[PDB]
């Protein structure tokens, strides 16, 4: 199992830029060609994202074309910026197991040593996340049926406060419902998130919980400054590899940079 995990693509419509000056569409097209030029090739690509920026259909058209051009099976989930209905219209083809129900988009993946769980934390008419009761009971079912086999969950919104002045108020509002599931299920050991446009990470019992940086713009973590900052600091994604018994995640820079070179002992410490 190798997984290329990106999120918060925030696609704009054909020939528009985020905020009028950040070319999210080019940036993402780059990321895609970047991803499908990887040497060690992932088994699938996950997008935990606010996939489009406004939830407009013209935006889904761009996303569909660009994400369509990835040479991998995709797993796609909605975000606060998404529109559940249109997400399903345009993207469901690229991720058939979302279903036909816009209001209950979710699915299990039982291909790898760790089962993957994809859920929709986004709630209509708000930035805040919400886990609905049918999401939770589906999740319980999945975890019970799964038994000892480890599980990881992908969701847009972080299930708990991370101390982020800007991002916490719009975290998953009823994230306790998931935290209680992790208490209930020892097999549940990863939860990965978007929304925060940052690599911020934590542990709750057996569960490693982390947000991902965005593919384009990022938002800094401030603790007592509520100013809605964003910046163009370096974008990356997470690769997830099953390593014997270990789920390991590593950051893979999406920035263009110098190198690599080879380490040489003689060059390292001359005499």
């Amino acid at each position: 199992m190798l997984l290329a995990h990106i999120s918060d693509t925030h696609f704009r419509s054909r020939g528009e830029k985020l905020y009028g000056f950040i070319d999210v569409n080019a940036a993402n097209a780059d990321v895609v060609s970047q991803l499908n030029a990887l040497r060690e090739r992932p088994d699938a690509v996950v997008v935990s994202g606010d996939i489009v920026n406004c939830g407009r259909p013209e935006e889904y058209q761009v996303a569909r074309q660009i994400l369509g051009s990835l040479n991998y099976p995709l797993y796609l989930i909605p975000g606060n910026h998404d529109d559940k209905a249109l997400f399903l219209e345009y993207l469901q083809p690229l991720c058939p197991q979302l279903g036909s129900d816009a209001n209950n988009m979710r699915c299990a993946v039982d291909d790898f040593a760790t089962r993957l769980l994809f859920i929709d934390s986004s709630r209509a008419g708000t930035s805040k996340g919400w886990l609905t009761d049918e999401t939770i009971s589906w999740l319980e079912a999945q975890l019970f049926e799964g038994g000892d086999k480890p599980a990881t969950i992908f969701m847009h919104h972080p299930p708990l406060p991370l101390g982020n002045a800007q991002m916490d108020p719009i975290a998953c509002e009823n994230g306790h419902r998931l935290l209680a599931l992790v208490e209930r299920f020892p097999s549940l050991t990863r939860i990965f998130c978007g929304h925060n446009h940052s690599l911020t990470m934590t542990q709750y019992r057996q569960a490693l919980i982390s947000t991902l940086p965005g593919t384009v713009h990022q938002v800094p973590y401030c603790h007592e400054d509520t100013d809605p900052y964003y910046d163009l600091s370096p974008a990356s994604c997470l690769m997830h590899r099953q390593v014997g018994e270990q789920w390991v995640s590593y950051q893979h820079s999406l920035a263009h940079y110098a190198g690599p070179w080879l380490y040489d002992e003689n060059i390292s410490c001359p005499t």
Copy 2:
């Protein structure tokens, strides 16, 4: 508790540059001025690193001066690139609780809600890590006599293989012995490491285990390829903050980049 956690500074002598072209001294001096210019100021700075590149005195001269210019208490642990005796001679004044025995440099910090444990995984004449008989014993003494207060460990070498072709054969060789301590002490919930020049993370039981990017040059994760790569992809560090019952770590970019701007809803989705 706010910790600025950097690693693998790899200082060189006054004249010199890493491999002849990477100006690690300048880059770290920048990182330093960067840190002590932060608006939300950390309580202390952790350097889990190969503080110097060759284990040379004039490298420690440079390190002492630059790290000395930080306006924070420091916690310094050595790496395989360090010289135990010289590390103590030059850096112990900047971190008195290392002791005055170069072979058992290690210490506990009890000021915060989570206990901090600093140890020396480096071993003379090999890049491999090793936990000395009584490092292990000292570790177990801290956890045994520590009760409920959660614990986090800083060591240079990662205590288990991560699937990194380059970095795994030079991980902490007897790391399974620390893993035995996490199996036995539910109290031990973070292990943070240098060595890998990368953010890669995994969990083992309650323990979040993660390596850090370097302050200057980075090394990419390859699973199949053993070629000793390094590159100049973006440097960052980890900020560790206590948020109620949670230890959260978030990546703080040390690159220079455009921004920040403020998010404006009308700019975000124009009509």
Copy 3:
């Protein structure tokens, strides 16, 4: 009184670039988000500009949207590149006190310790500036009624030659009419200009007279080379602050750059 003063935005139509390769539309959208993310927030924004590049209506649509997104009262004046009629159609809403008369767009602002005067120096069918007699007599009236209270004037074209081989021939052709006004009125003490895409400054009696750099591309000052150069050297704007009895103007970089850091005496001169 804090004033953010930009000019020569040179907007192109939706999805066009200046000269086919300079993205003035993105650059300006950046400037706008930059401006309305300032910490010390200006009381209003002035644009002395060639606001659009060709005077086409599609161009005014872009300008209207982008300038519209600023979170400040605007003061807007035409330039040689502008079309008086369309300027008034699209932008007058964003600057109501221009009037209903396209041919006599001007206004006084008596909010601050210094009165602000906004005038149209642009003349149809030419690059050269022209101050019409009704502009001058309005200006005399304003200056008389104003008495001792200091005045500053904003106009697209510089009222005198600045020794610029390219820019002088297309300076304000009858700028003497204004120079004579400054001789007449001691209270008239600033005149600020666009057109030159440069910070070039001078003094005539009591009057500080300066052109501003553009928000995107710039044009160098050559003394005996008439070649119509332009470049992408760094863009900035002028901030104007009333400082007790002094009108002070300072350059505020619109470029993205490293820093800031804090000055530390110890880091400055080590021992």
Copy 4:
């Protein structure tokens, strides 16, 4: 008359960099080669600066060599970062008319249509400026015996507050005494300064008063914030040219940037 006016070079010793990471020596060497490569060559170069950073001899060694490599007559005045005695020892050979008394370094230049006045506002053991009893007297002697010929003054410290939180308390403390000279001598029409690492400008009576950006690092203008910031926003200098009766100053970027291209009307507005 064409003057290349740079300021605040802040040289360091041969090995060293400003604050450990800003390579001021390289940057100035570049600025130098830049200047003596100009197509329209200035008649002289003014450095109003803190020529060196620490007042150290080996800094003056570096400065002497780099400034010595300019292919122009020089006018050098000290700043608060300079050492009066050492400034004279190392730099007086590159600017003989400073005299040979380190405490009254000052001189008039009578070659051009405007008289040039160079003075030393620096004062031992404070960052504050100060005009010595007989600097003031010498100033007034030049203006009194000078008749109609216009005068411009170069001094390191700005002679009045500019509203800069950082820079104002360290302006020229008795600067009002020079202001008294401008009230009394209509002949004195430019005052140009270093210190602020910024282009900020104001007028007092006939006098245009402006500070300059530094050749390397800059300091931003804050009104409310006293935090001692510096940053690496674009460096530039001022070119001063005599154009008939006018002294004009225009900003010459010292950054490296794309361009120039030629303006083509058909490329500008395609059909």
Copy 5:
């Protein structure tokens, strides 16, 4: 004779990017303004190119406008990416001597000391090059009639293998037909090519044969790696100057970079 020789522009349609992220349209518009801002001005511009990327008419519209804006006579030839019919519809006006026959686009230029020969090596429905028999016999005629006067040939595809794993298989498939012409004709002494997006060069008897880098993206030369790489390494073009008896070609960078400065003996080796 001065010739500015560019190729493989790969224009996309209005408001599209190559692969979704490389702005070939802006890049080329830059190149054009760059070219027609040259100080030593070429006599004509040659484009050996894959002029558009997909051979769509909307793409030819962009190419026609941008290439149209060059201030030089053009010589234009098709490539594998081109569509012969549409090439002739849109571009023939900018290069009248292509003819009216889309299937036999070629021409001689007898203005300079060296005769220039322009031919179409592109073949419908393939990437491979093909020299048709009527191309060859026209070429023989031209070479015979030409006598002793030297000749150079411009064609999209390289007439022989260059050892390039990616590019060789799609080289000119029957390039032997041209190689045999060079054996036959001593006056034929240059052959210049596109396709390879690289400066790779060789000699066959009297003939210097070289491919050109592209104006935007480039493709590296690999010898036994067939992976279809491309990169954004620096773009350049070739200038061709008749220098007495010598045809000389030099690379002219199309990248934006620092300088130039002037070499100074004293600055070069200080004492």
Copy 6:
């Protein structure tokens, strides 16, 4: 046969930078690490260069160490910036077949399908090139006794004028004498040179003659302008590979740039 051919490294002393600001040492160290990190590894490295800038010993110290760190056999020839005696003292151990007579440093290489000829065109006390009486004789001996085996020559100075205003008067003064050898020996088919810091190429009979860009700074070709320019446009080198009967040379960029990605036909032309 694969050759990595670089030129004009222009090393400086340990502390120093070229002209005070170009860090040639770092740049070359980078170029070095770059080269010995190549995936398709050359058989040897050619440096046709002005190996050092001033002909100083401490420059040769630096060069010896950096060039010494290459993991390839080297072929080193001097340029006008070199000192014959010191070049031999420091570099002959890295290239034994130069001999031990500093005035006739030269050698043949017979390992590959094409014979390699290395000579010293430099002449004490002038920038001009010169082929010593018996360099010429030795050259003719190699070609005479060499039969059919093709020959290529590496010399610092170009053997004929190239129309370069700056570089021509300092070409190889008696270069016509080598040209006489190509007229007489059809066997001699490549001449490769340094000196010009540029890729300029021409053919004379069977001989492809080309100069190389420098590893660091470049000099532009001007025909009319004699101003001694240099700039920092992109550095590259030449790779020489034997491909059947062909010697092919291709430019290998040494800049750091975005890419590579893989060409995907569907991404290239979307529907």
